[PDB]
Ligand SMILES: OC[C@H]1O[C@@H](O[C@H]2[C@H](O)[C@@H](O)[C@H](O[C@H]3[C@H](O)[C@@H](O)[C@H](O[C@H]4[C@H](O)[C@@H](O)[C@H](O)O[C@@H]4CO)O[C@@H]3CO)O[C@@H]2CO)[C@H](O)[C@@H](O)[C@@H]1O
Ligand SMILES: *[C@@H]1O[C@H](CO)[C@@H](O)[C@H](O)[C@H]1NC(C)=O
């Protein structure tokens with residue numbers, strides 16, 4: 001259980017974005033039905049009033065929280081990968097429009113899942129804004145918690161992979177558009193019961209054997225990181 005509070009741009013807090021520039025759900029309950037419109041931007045997908053200004057090469061940092069900002073972020077049990085996708089706001093998240101900018105499952109070195117490092121990062125994880133066409137975008141941050149992903153939701157609707165999905169409204173002003181955005185995947189649609197990384201037993205199988213759901217990170221992506229980039233306690 002976890003939600004996005006707001007974003008930082010180049011380490012500068014953009015302030016509370018909930019129902020302002022985040023298309024926020026009414027609570028932190030997971031999405032589990034892979035076929036549901038809820039897979040797009042969670043259970044309350046509607047244009048909210050603001051879109052955060054950024055330029056290509058900016059560092060955009062998502063800040064997640066559990067109950068209160070900068071609390072324990074998400075339950076330690078919710079081991080799993082973290083992905084970020086982008087779509088033209090034009091799409092409203094409909095059609096084959098979602099392009100992956102970031103994937104992080106398990107770091108063999110430190111033996112921590114992306115979710116583990118997010119808690120350590122005080123809920124902060126980032127992507128570098130790609131050189132797409134200036135315009136309005138949705139950035140879809142996705143945490144997959146696998147603490148019950150040994151089952152499928154479609155077979156046993158009280159278990160299954162859990163998706164914490166947050167769409168941010170981002171306006172890209174300055175960009176040379178050196179990497180125009182391709183068509184991407186649909187959500188709902190890209191994840192099915194068969195898709196690798198959806199059904200997996202973190203209790204019996206080693207985390208090094210884990211393979212995150214496709215698609216692969218777009219060649220136009222400029223990477224990203226899970227790490228604190230500023231102190232919410234001083235805001
Ligand atoms: O630990 C391995 C074990 O995990 C089992 O699943 C557990 C989870 O480990 C546990 O973290 C999870 O806790 C949930 C709880 O069910 C929710 O009701 C609660 O929701 C809260 C929310 O936290 C608050 O933020 C909000 O304000 O209120 C709601 C109350 O409605 O959130 C916590 C997580 O934060 O519970 C699971 C059991 O249901 C697996 O089942 C098992 O297979 C594993 O072995
Ligand atoms: C999953 O969502 C689809 C589409 O909204 C719906 O038809 C189906 O009833 C849902 N499954 C469950 C278990 O509710």
Ligand SMILES: [Cl-]
Nearest residue numbers: 001147148162
């Ligand atoms: Cl749970």
Ligand SMILES: [Cu+2]
Nearest residue numbers: 001002075078
């Ligand atoms: Cu939870």
